[PDB]
Amino acid sequence: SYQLNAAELQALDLIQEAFKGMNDPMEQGRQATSFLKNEKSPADIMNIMDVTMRRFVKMAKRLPAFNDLSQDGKFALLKGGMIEMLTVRGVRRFDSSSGSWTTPTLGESSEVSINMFDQLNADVRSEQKMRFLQFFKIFHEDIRSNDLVISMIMLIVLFSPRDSITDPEDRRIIARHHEQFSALLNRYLESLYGDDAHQLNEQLPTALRMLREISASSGMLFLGTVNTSEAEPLPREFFKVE
Amino acid sequence: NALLRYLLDKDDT
Numbered sequence: 126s127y128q129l130n131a132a133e134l135q136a137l138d139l140i141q142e143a144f145k146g147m148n149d150p151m152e153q154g155r156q157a158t159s160f161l162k163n164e165k166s167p168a169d170i171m172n173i174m175d176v177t178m179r180r181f182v183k184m185a186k187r188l189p190a191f192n193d194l195s196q197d198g199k200f201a202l203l204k205g206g207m208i209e210m211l212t213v214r215g216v217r218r219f220d221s222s223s224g225s226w227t228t229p230t231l232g233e234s235s236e237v238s239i240n241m242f243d244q245l246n247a248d249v250r251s252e253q254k255m256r257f258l259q260f261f262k263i264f265h266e267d268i269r270s271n272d273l274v275i276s277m278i279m280l281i282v283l284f285s286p287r288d289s290i291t292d293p294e295d296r297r298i299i300a301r302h303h304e305q306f307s308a309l310l311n312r313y314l315e316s317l318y319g320d321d322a323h324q325l326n327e328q329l330p331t332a333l334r335m336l337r338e339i340s341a342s343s344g345m346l347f348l349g350t351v352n353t354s355e356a357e358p359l360p361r362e363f364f365k366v367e
Numbered sequence: 368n369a370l371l372r373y374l375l376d377k378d379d380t
């Protein structure tokens with residue numbers, strides 16, 4: 126039987142609990158103002174991603190799996206995985222018809238166009254744009270729009286082995302959860318789709334390679350295009366602006 | 368990465 130057992134259902138409930146605030150409203154402030162501007166600048170894009178980044182930190186801090194790590198292990202995982210998780214949120218939030226990202230607390234008139242890439246650093250913008258579109262295209266529409274699938278992919282990439290993590294128990298915990306989240310994702314998809322799920326599982330390593338590549342090559346995208354006085358600091362820890 | 372560390376280490380309650 127492909128039906129989920131109690132432990133699998135409970136793991137999914139816990140994941141949904143940890144992610145439950147990602148879609149909360151924004152408060153008035155720099156980030157909301159940036160999302161609401163029709164004419165967005167590169168700095169506005171940084172201000173927008175700040176919301177998602179802050180919320181990923183909070184999500185992780187709810188997970189028992191994350192809380193079994195040392196503080197240094199937790200820090201290394203977030204630093205190493207932030208942009209990868211952000212890119213997966215980007216796939217969930219991208220509308221192929223409109224060629225834009227939206228957010229679930231604002232209407233369709235509020236968006237970030239794919240063509241915002243055309244304003245970024247010419248050294249890297251073209252291939253980052255193409256990589257994002259190619260990554261988006263490998264997903265089936267009903268899978269990239271499934272919040273539980275997206276959340277699990279985020280956790281699979283968050284719980285990746287990182288060379289800087291040296292505590293042996295941290296490394297063990299990370300490896301075990303990488304495996305567990307991958308297996309749970311496949312079980313979930315089997316419970317919905319039966320044998321047809323297996324093709325999705327077979328594609329996961331291809332997806333992850335594309336995800337790691339795009340995220341690892343993102344760091345200079347804003348260089349020369351942003352004044353630090355206009356952009357949130359957290360994204361500036363991941364993207365070099367000066 | 369001072370701000371990432373701060374956000375990780377803060378009491379969100």
Ligand SMILES: C[C@H](CCC[C@H](C)C(=O)O)[C@H]1CC[C@H]2[C@@H]3CC=C4C=C(O)CC[C@]4(C)[C@H]3CC[C@]12C
Pocket residue numbers: 147170173174176177208211212214215216218226227228229237253254257339340342343346
């Ligand atoms: C997910 C986000 C839109 C919704 C944000 C909102 C606060 C929410 O999470 O609901 C979009 C807006 C800009 C996108 C990045 C632009 C360039 C990028 C450059 C790349 O090389 C990869 C992907 C990213 C990081 C994009 C990921 C998704 C972002 C953060």
